[PDB]
Each structure stands twice: as structure tokens, then as C-alpha cells.
Curated annotation (Swiss-Prot), chains A, B, C, D:
PANTHER family: PTHR48408, XYLOSE ISOMERASE (PTHR48408:SF1). The lineage of its organism: Bacteria, Bacillati, Actinomycetota, Actinomycetes, Micrococcales. Mg(2+) 1 binds at residues 179, 215, 243, 291. Pfam families: AP_endonuc_2. It is an enzyme of class 5 (isomerase). The active site is at 52, 55. This is Xylose isomerase. It catalyses: alpha-D-xylose = alpha-D-xylulofuranose.
């Protein structure tokens, strides 16, 4: 497992920089200087860094302060060669955003939130980022009568189309990536899953540059299959970015290291990212980003250790996933289970609906009881998969 | 609570007809004659009945048998005046469908499944049904390598576009309604939630007549907010049908009577169906269908009792939900929380992105700390809602 | 709904004083003075107030500071008449308790957590509290190999039995109540549910004075039936205190107002607290403590509103629950479903196991098919409860 | 992976013989003959076979039939050498147990369920079983007012203590093991987790011979940590038997092959069964029983494949788990994280509660801020386990 910048492993400033405050306690770690994060990450083999506007530039920063911080940060980047592929906006920590940014009930707050986004598109464009992520963490409610739900989607759309229009207008080479989360910090968050994110994009005026940024753990907080969810994003050609982390069930957002949650699911996500679909189709080509948090029990050792562990796990999974598809025994099991058979169209070329109702062999004389005896042998194909994952074969 | 056919309460044949077999035991109730179901339902105040092709016509039925059953069933309908607003296909109980219907890995099975659908579109059209529901219960997997996930969506699309093309072609006044379910009977089901159902429809050639049929309990098995999910379907103008039942958490599909699961969520769904959105927008206008199962502990009493309980609960919720919006105290609390305020566009008419970045009052001189002092008073608006639900006020 | 001090409504200092920082944001409210909490709680109708040592006395407070704080506090108590029924210790906020208090892997942190508990028992005695609550919030792990799981329970026992021997040696009139939680802030918390808590107590040397403190939301984070769990606690005569709140599903601890989560479960929880068991048995007669958090979207008017709403909600449910059991149609429905029949012993007085084996009418001569026809009528019985809850009956 | 009879791999008749009916469909496989199950299990390397009375003897079987069935069965056992380590009773399939066995509201069903249990104890004795398992699958409710919850536990106690007195009076060398399940087939099952099961046993008269039978998937249906739950059972010396399988989340009981659910948890479960506790303590030495279902998509080649896969999976995990603990880098990592340190008593030999209170270096003179700097290094320790599990180390 030796990462290299050709792997395209990206990390957020807030990931290794997470200080350790959770809702039951305060920080266990001192703040991390952004110059050091950049240097350290570059020596680990990372390809780039990502930040929320306020991870770097304090909310209340004066202009002299802002310029100093960017000079320092631009210095570090020049020095190490790290790229800045994604930039996002913090529309959830200041008290002003307690009801949302884009979908706040207070109209003045909505205006400030959108203004804040627009300024950050400029920053992102100047840093050379290709993706602009939107995570609407405070968009939602605890109680069902708190919102007009139709107006909430209208407001949402208005903010996202305004940002997309501005990108088009300014000539910037950026795409927006929506990032779904079912709950936390709100009781219910708007556009809860990958499916709801895809759906909403189809109702936008400038939806052509608006896509998804799915996060492992987020999908798993509604108990969904991450791999199935990104497969649908990919099939719609909307998988613009990916956030990899780990979660161990339906509960608070854990943000563990990728592979430290549901392991078999992590193996099949790697397989999908690396091998694509068995019958061919689109392949994911962007950065492999890690939006995790080093457990608060661990000191600064642990922070670089956990950063190292993300890349190790991905690499270890990749090696196994490549060995798995290369295996001749796995290819035969795949043919036997009908994996390649699923890729053949149901209908024969130029055969219509009426033509099919009409074929006797297809319905009226179809031997249903005889077709039902097929042994799909999915258990054995899963056993082969697990034995490659364990490095048994 | 006195239902009347003007309420548009519909029930499936398989709902009151559910015999009681679950995966740990056999039936506790004798089979229900479809003629009696129709008569009984008509005396309760139901508006119509719905069935799966095989709920009525046995899989192996000869043609003389098929004609007899339809004559009996058409007799009963003529006699009672009951309508048949929705018809669906059973693509999950016979052993042939163990891997799916439309997305089975075996191509011959896919062909039979689609042929079976096409024949059932004819039946539906002859019964005067307006909606054709598709529930893909066996479309999915237990194991991640069992399917090419892209090919599975291609196959799915091919089956649904073929059915839609056939409706268009035949001149039938029917619309397809996809019905999402996260899991059970498979480990993971394709198009798990309302969001995934909406998304998939946008990738179809004939998506204009393809919409959703969300079920209360299905959304709640992924822990989502039913009311938020149908609000998005409504906003996209894709809420073609609705299945009401109850569920008490993330676990097996319980199918309890509507209102016998999450009660406050049942109240806000009724409010949405009855009152629409606070600021106006689309309103749901079809049948209120109940896809529940009378608990197996209860005898034939209980079966009509539980059918009666569905309509009672809906009516009782409706009365409370109407009282709630009519209340002057509730309207003031609503104004105070910014519910109507959310309906105002963020931007002023003909104000662009650049115009907003540029307004000083919106960003550079916006007093964030002062805007953050607003008391949204969402707890009190929720207390008013609950006190109307309990018939306290 | 007019709460009075014999209702035994007690509130934590940390509930109304919760300022609003969650894991994605900053406090939204100004700190609340302890003297001002006592005055407000007492005016609203509360009977008592509870606290965590560090809620009242800063962790850093000098001895001088300690004594000053306790004088104003005791003065307010004296001026208002509020009791202090339960006191608890903070073994979770300071960075030192990052791997736990009693089960920390570091031996010198275990002794410091235990010494902090012992000093807090002297303060509990001093304030006249009858219950000392233990929430082991940091006792657990993110990863399975972090702990020797046998040792962790041995260290948990050592702490609780040391503390209990100290009560007994000092002759304080005080009981220990453990408070289970499945997760958050740890991935997995030890003694995660009522059941684990009850079992663990049977392994203690001093178990006689150790009981439970179940919290609504906590059991509902594992998808358990809170009425059923507190019924089991009560049946073992181990329900020493109770914490009431709201939770809308399997997700982060929400701490809503009691009744703003699962409404029907809250109804049945109030029925067990107030009415006890249909056939007679134990009754819980301690205080009704509200361990919740005023939503961060709301100002101080919401804070006092939310405190008032907990009380209101319990009183509305109480009156509906009393009306429900008093109702003769409900009592007949109960009779029909066999609620009273379950109260009869299975064996006749003096019947041995050998006797029943050998009794031909209970096995050999048993008509199982006839017995299976019984209509338990559980659906009609549930419909009667909801109708009563909706104030329709 | 070459399983042999000293591995103590036992299998239920109902697992491989599970024909495939779920709640949405019909059996997909032909019945499996009991004599043929014994021959196949024995050839594959199993050590024993287990059954439910009705798995082997039809509920209707005449006495003539009974004796015939038991002769071919005993003959196969004799020919193969397979033991019969555990026997259980079916108190869930026949319509008569629709409201339970031992806790049915109907008194004559309670006596019939108890008499069926007593007769089954004579058969258990007769086959040389050491454990009699009790799964109370129908003991529970859909609705909260269906039962008097105190009475239900009293009726559950009566049944288990009657049965245990019968063992003791007859001097059978047999222990009772209760098997918890949170839900399915009931909405809420009584004694839903390891914890509730352990607590309930402490209320019995004959508790000394009553223990638990935890099942992987069952605790994982409430989102609990299975290693942590069986650790608590083991710590109380109550782990009498164990049922191993796979579950991918909070949903319907899947009964996958052991290792095809949560892989990292299975790894740590094998470590506790085989290796026990890091600091020494109790060890479980009973049989490793596989209570799972061969996926319905597969034919008989899948059935024998799946039985083989359970064994393989346990043996691959066993070898990786042994390699993992033997590894000196892992032993040093363990030392660094304080795994061995937790094994030391908090108090010094002879130290009283008063002593520690009064010891200035454990409280007053404690540097909490210094103690909080410790790097527990739990993330690196988890990375070492996964690397070992992936056969990388």
C-alpha cells in the first residue's frame, strides 16, 4: 500500500483538523495550523486538500487577516504541490444558520447565506477547484409543522440555480455537488438520500452542472446500500465527487476511517470505483476524498495514523478487488449466476410490446416451474468474494 | 367519522383477504371469496377495490376458470357500485420470480415477467382503472456481487418504458406508479425510497405517464419522514397514488392500520393531503388506499373492524387537521415561526447574483449576530399541533 | 393542565440551561443563571430541580467559589420551596474522560473518576437527594479491540460497589440508579439498554441499593418498546427514577419534549406510571423527571414554553389515560382480548409438572385447531385506545 | 479450512431444510429428508445436528408415525456418529400459538404450550442433548394495550420454572438456554436482547440451570454490538450455547451465512469464542451452532455450499484471529492503548472508599489536563486488526 498523488486521495482541513468537541464534551486536541496540515498531508502522499470557507478564514476575519491567511495557505500549496480540488461553504455553525441557510424561514438570513455562497464560488475559482460541494446540514426541521415543504424546495432550488447561473455567467470551470444526509444536526434533513438528491437536480434550470457528492456513512444512517446508491448516481452520470468514511449502523454520524465501518460494503465500493460495472458502463474518475474524524481518544500521532489508515485501507481493498475480478474461478461463478446475462436486452432488436405478448414461448407456453429450478448460486459467488477480501485465495 | 364513497377510500383484495401466513407460521384465517370482499367493503363505505392479477385469477387458472371468476367479480362490482381504480401485477410470489421479474438475471424470466405485465395492462384497462402500480419486490439482492448494478437499472427501464409505450399505443387512460421499498423480501431493493423512484423516472423515454405510489411504512423502514417524502413527490407533480398503513419503527413490514404506527406523522400526512401547503401549491387528488394487513391474532370480526378502523382514523385525523389550520392561535404561531415568510422568493424580482453579492445590507454589513436572536418558536407551534391532535383545544 | 408540586415534576438544570451547541454548531442562547432557573421552575409548578456537580460548580472552581455558589443556590431553594430529589456527576465533558470514567483504560483516570463520584455523594446527602444517578456516557468503544470486555465489567462493578458501600457506611438515605444508553457519544456504550442494566446489578455485592433510571429516547435509539422495558424494570422492583423525553426514531439523541416523539408510546407510558397493571401489581411512585433539550432554533421564550409543554403533555396524557381505563367499553374489550385472563396462573393450585403432562385434556385430548379460532380482537382494543387518546371517546 | 468434528460445528435441521417460503412467496426447494440431512451434515464435517420437535415429527403424527420417524432418525445418527447437542420446541408455527405459547392471553393455550414443552424435555433427555433452547417467538405484541406487562413476565416465569423443576426432579443432565429476539414475528417480543434475557433469569426460582442462547442477527436487529452482548453473558457465566449467522442491518431477520453480514464484528466474535479475554477470564467451550437460511435464489447445490461456507468462514476467521493476537506488534499496540491496564484494580489492595477520597493525588492534587493528553491510540490498534483480518499482516 504506498499512496502516491496519482491515487488522487484528498482530505478536508476539518478532518485532520477536527479538535474533538462533540455534543457531550470539549476538544481533546489543540487547533491545527493550516500550513502544517498541508505539509503533513503532502508527506503522507495525499493529492489535495479541501476546506469550508470558515475552516481557513474565520467568520469575523478582517481583510488584512484574510489576506495573511491566504498568503500563508497559498505559500504552503506552492511549496508542497498539493491541489485544492473541492471547496465548500459553512452554512451550519454560526448561530444565524440555526434554521438553515438557503431554506431558513427568515428571508434576510436566506439572502446572507446565498451571498456567502457566491463570494465562496469566487474563492473556489481562484484556488483552481473543479467541484463546489453543497451540504445543507441545517435545512430541515425537528417538527412537521415548522415548514411549508413545497416552499422549502422552491427556496432550495432558487439558491442552487442562482449559484449555477453565476458559475455559468462568470465562465468558471466548476460543477456543484449536492451532499445528502438524512438527519443530524436536524431531526429530518431535506433531500435525505442520493435518490432525493438526483430527483431535485431534475427540477432545476441549470441542473446540467449540478450533481452529487454521496458520503458512505450518510447513506448508512438510513440503512441503505452505499454501493447501490452510487451505482444509480453513476448510471445517471451524476457522480461528481465521493466522500469515503465508515459508519457502524444507524446512529449519530461517526465519521470513522474508510473501511473501519461496514467492511464488505467498503470492498464492493472499491470494486465499483476501480473495476466499474461487469458489463461495462460509466466509470468514476474524480478524487477519492476522506471526510472522517480522528477519534477524540487519540492524540496527534493518531491524527496522522488515521489519515494514513484511510489510504492504506483503500489500497488494501483495491488490491483485493483487482485480484477478485482477475480470478478465473470468480469469472465462471459470475457467468453461472447470470451477471453477464443481465446485460442482454430483454427484447430482441426491433421486437415490440405487441410482438412479445404474442410470442407463445415467452408467456402462454412458458414453463414457469422449469425456469424456477435454476440454481443462481449467489451464496457461492459471495463466498468467493469474501475469501478474496480475507486474502484466503 | 362516517365514511362515504366521496372520501375515496380504496382497499386491496389482499388486505382484508390476507390469510395470516408470515415467515414463522401458517394462515390463521380461511380464504376470502372475492364476491364477499366487494359486498362487505361496499357496506363499510369504501369507494373501490384493487387487486394483484393473481389475488383474483390463480396463476394456473384455465380460461374457463378465468372467465367464471371475472363474471362473478364483475357481477359483484355492478351490484355494489364499487370502482376498480388501481390494478397491479404479482411479480414476487411464484418461485420463478426469486431473482426478480424485470431485473431477474435469467433473460427468459424477464420476458415472461414483462409479458405478464402487458396482459395485466389489458385487464386494468378493461376494469376502468386509472392507475397501474409497479412494486418490484424481488428486484434487488442479498449480496453485493450478485448484480451488475448499471445493467439492473437498464433492465428496469426497458420493462417500464415497454409498459408505458404499450399504454400510449393502445390509447388507454392509465398511468404507471412506481412503489418503493428499501428491503424485504430482498436484502436491498432497487429504487429504495421516494427519492430513488423520482430519480429513475427522469431517465425514462416515457416518464410523462410514470409517477409514484409511496407507502407510509415503506418510507419508515429507512427511518425517513413520510410527509417530507410525499411533499417532494407532490412538488415534482409525481404523486399519482398513495398507500396508507402504519409501522412502528425500522423492522419487518408491519402493515398495521393507518394511524396505528407513528401517530403524529399520520396527523401531518392527513394535514398535507387535506390542507395542502400553507403557501399554496399542488394538492393530492386521488384515492386514499389502505395496503395494511389485519393482524393474524384476530378472526373475521377483526378483519372488518380493522377495515373500519382505517377509515375512522383517517376521518378523525382529518377533523383535527381542519380544526388545526382554522384555529386563529395556530395561524399567529405560523406567522411568528416564518412559515408564510418561507414562501417569499429570496431575491427581489429582476435582482441577479451579481446584484446580491454587491448589496451591502445582504452581506458586508449584515448583522449576523442580531439576525440569530430571532425566536423561531417552533416548539410552541408543535405544542399547538399536538394539542389539536389530542382534542384538547 | 395546571401542574402543581404534588405531580412530582422535577427538571434538570442542564435541560432548560442547555445553550445549544450540538456537534455542527455553537450555542444559540446566553448562559442561564442557576438562581434564575430555580425561580422560573418553581413559578411554573415544578416540584424539584436536579443537577450534575459541574452544572452548578465549575470543574475549576476554588473552594471559596464552591461555597459562594452553594449559598446563593441553597437560598433560592429556600426562597422557592423546590426540592433536590436527584443529583448526578459529570463523567463525560472534560477531556480526561475521553475513554470513560469508571472503565477508562488508564488506572489513574479510573481513581480520579471514582473520587469525584464519592465527593458528589457527600453533596447529594447534603442536599437531601434520595437518588444518585449514574450515566456512563463515555464507558464503551468505537472499535471492538479497544477493551478487554470482561475487565470493563469488572471495573464498572468496582466503581458501583465502592460507591454503594460508601452510601451504606455513611448511612446516607440514597439509592443508585444507572442510566442506560446504547450509543452516543461512544460507538457502543456498555450496559446499553434496560435489560443490560438490570442484569449487571444482579452481579454487584451491594445490589440491594442499586436500581435503574430508564430514559425514553435512549431505549428508542435501539428500536425497543419503552413501556415494555420500564414494565420489566418495575416487575423486578428496580425502577428507581425515570427520565421522560421524545425521540423520533433511530438517530442521534434528540431530547425533545415528552410527547413530541412517539405519541402512542408516551400515552401507554403515562398509563403504566399512573395506572400500573390491569390485574394489579407494582406501581412506580417516584418523581417524573424531564431530561430533554429546548430546540436551538428558539429563544428563552421557547425554553420556558418547552418546560411548560413537558408538564402539559404529561397532564393531557394522564387525563386521557384515566378516561380510557375507566370506560366500560374498553373494560369489556380487555375482557374479550384476555387481558385479565393472562393474570390467572397456568397451573391449578397444587398442580405439578407431572400432573399437567398426564392431564389428557391439556395435550393429548386438546383440540388445537378449535383453540386457534379465537378472535383475540387486539385491533379493536388498539382502536379504542387511540380514539381515547384523540379525545373522541 | 478443513472442518473436523472436534470443531463442534452443529447445525439445525430447519436451516439446510428451510425450503424458502418468506412472507412474499412460496417455497423454492423440495422438502429435505431428515435421514439425508444427517448423512450430508456428517460427510461435510459437522459434529452434531439439532431440531425443533415439529422439524422431525409432524404436529399431527400418530404415535405409530412418531416411533417410525425416530427409528430411521436414530439409525442415521448411529450410522454417521452425529451427536444431538440441543433440541428445541416449536411454539410458533401452528395457528394456536398466534398470541404466544407461555404468554398467550388464553389460559388453555398456555397449558397446551407448557405440556408440549414437557414432553419435548423427555425427548431431549432421550437423545442425549445437554441444552434445551427456548425461542419465545410469539411472546409479545403489536399493540401496547394487548397485554398486562407484569402478568406476561409472571406467565413467562411460571413456564420456565415449571420446565426447570421438571429437569431437576427427573435428574436430566440438561440446561435451559433462552433465545432473545427484539421483533419478528411480533411487533415487540418480550425479553428482546441479551440484557433482558439475563435479567429475567435472576427472577426465576430455578435460575441456576437457566442461561442464554444469543444469536448474532437478533442482537444486530436492535443495532447492538454482538461481541459486547455475548461478553456480558460470558462474564455472568450464562453463555450456554450460541447461534451464529449474518445480518446486514436493522431489518427483517436475514439468517445469512456466518461472516456474510457484519464481517469485522464476526472477526471479533470468533476472537472472544476462541481466544477469550486479553487479561484472562472465562472462556465459552460449548458448540458452535449455525442458525441461518440458505438463500431462496439457490438450489440444493447452494444449500450444501452454504453449510460448508459457515464452517469455512469460522475457520478463516479463527486462523486470522489467532495470528492477530500472537503478533508482537499487536501486543505492544494493546499495551499502548491500556488493554492490559484495564485489568488492574482501581483501588489498591486494602484501600477503602474513605482512603481514596482522602488521597490528595487522586483528586485534589490530580492534574486532569495532563492526564487528558494521553494518546490512547485506538485507531492504530483497529488498523492492525483489520490488516490481520485482510491477511496483509
Amino acid at each position: 500500500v504506498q499512496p502516491t498523488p496519482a491515487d488522487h486521495f484528498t482530505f478536508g482541513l476539518w478532518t485532520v483538523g477536527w479538535t474533538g468537541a462533540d455534543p457531550f464534551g470539549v476538544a481533546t486536541r489543540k487547533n491545527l495550523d493550516p500550513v502544517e496540515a498541508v505539509h503533513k498531508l503532502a508527506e503522507l502522499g495525499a493529492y489535495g486538500i479541501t476546506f469550508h470557507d470558515n475552516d481557513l478564514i474565520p467568520f469575523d476575519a478582517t481583510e488584512a487577516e484574510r489576506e495573511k491567511i491566504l498568503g500563508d495557505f497559498n505559500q504552503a500549496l506552492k511549496d508542497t504541490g498539493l491541489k485544492v480540488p473541492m471547496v465548500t461553504t459553512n452554512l451550519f455553525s454560526h448561530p444565524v444558520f440555526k434554521d438553515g441557510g438557503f431554506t431558513s424561514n427568515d428571508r434576510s438570513i436566506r439572502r446572507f447565506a446565498l451571498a456567502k455562497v457566491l463570494h465562496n464560488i469566487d474563492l473556489a475559482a481562484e484556488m483552481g477547484a473543479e467541484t463546489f460541494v453543497m451540504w445543507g446540514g441545517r435545512e430541515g426541521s425537528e417538527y412537521d409543522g415548522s415548514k411549508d415543504l413545497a416552499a422549502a424546495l422552491d427556496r432550495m432550488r432558487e439558491g442552487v440555480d442562482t449559484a449555477a447561473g453565476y458559475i455559468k455567467d462568470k465562465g468558471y470551470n466548476l460543477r456543484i455537488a449536492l451532499e445528502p444526509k438524512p438527519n443530524e444536526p436536524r431531526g429530518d434533513i431535506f433531500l435525505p438520500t442520493v435518490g432525493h438528491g438526483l430527483a431535485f437536480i431534475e427540477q432545476l434550470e441549470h441542473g446540467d452542472i449540478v450533481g452529487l457528492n454521496p458520503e458512505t456513512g450518510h447513506e448508512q444512517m438510513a440503512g441503505l446500500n452505499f454501493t447501490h446508491g452510487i451505482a444509480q448516481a453513476l448510471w445517471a452520470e451524476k457522480l461528481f465527487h465521493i466522500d469515503l468514511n465508515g459508519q457502524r449502523g444507524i446512529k449519530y454520524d461517526q465519521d470513522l476511517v474508510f473501511g473501519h465501518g461496514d467492511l464488505t460494503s467498503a470492498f464492493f465500493t472499491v470494486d465499483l470505483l476501480e473495476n466499474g460495472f461487469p458489463n461495462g458502463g460509466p466509470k468514476y474518475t474524480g478524487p477519492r476524498h476522506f471526510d472522517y474524524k480522528p477519534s477524540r481518544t487519540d492524540g496527534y500521532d493518531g491524527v496522522w495514523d488515521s489519515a494514513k489508515a484511510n489510504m492504506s485501507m483503500y489500497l488494501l481493498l483495491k488490491e483485493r478487488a483487482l485480484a477478485f475480478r482477475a480470478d478465473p474461478e470468480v469469472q465462471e461463478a459470475m457467468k453461472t449466476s447470470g451477471v453477464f446475462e443481465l446485460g442482454e436486452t430483454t427484447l430482441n432488436a426491433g421486437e415490440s410490446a405487441a410482438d412479445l405478448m404474442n410470442d407463445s414461448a415467452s408467456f402462454a407456453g412458458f414453463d414457469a416451474e422449469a425456469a424456477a429450478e435454476r440454481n443462481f448460486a449467489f451464496i457461492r459467488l459471495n463466498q468467493l468474494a469474501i475469501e478474496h477480501l480475507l486474502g484466503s485465495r
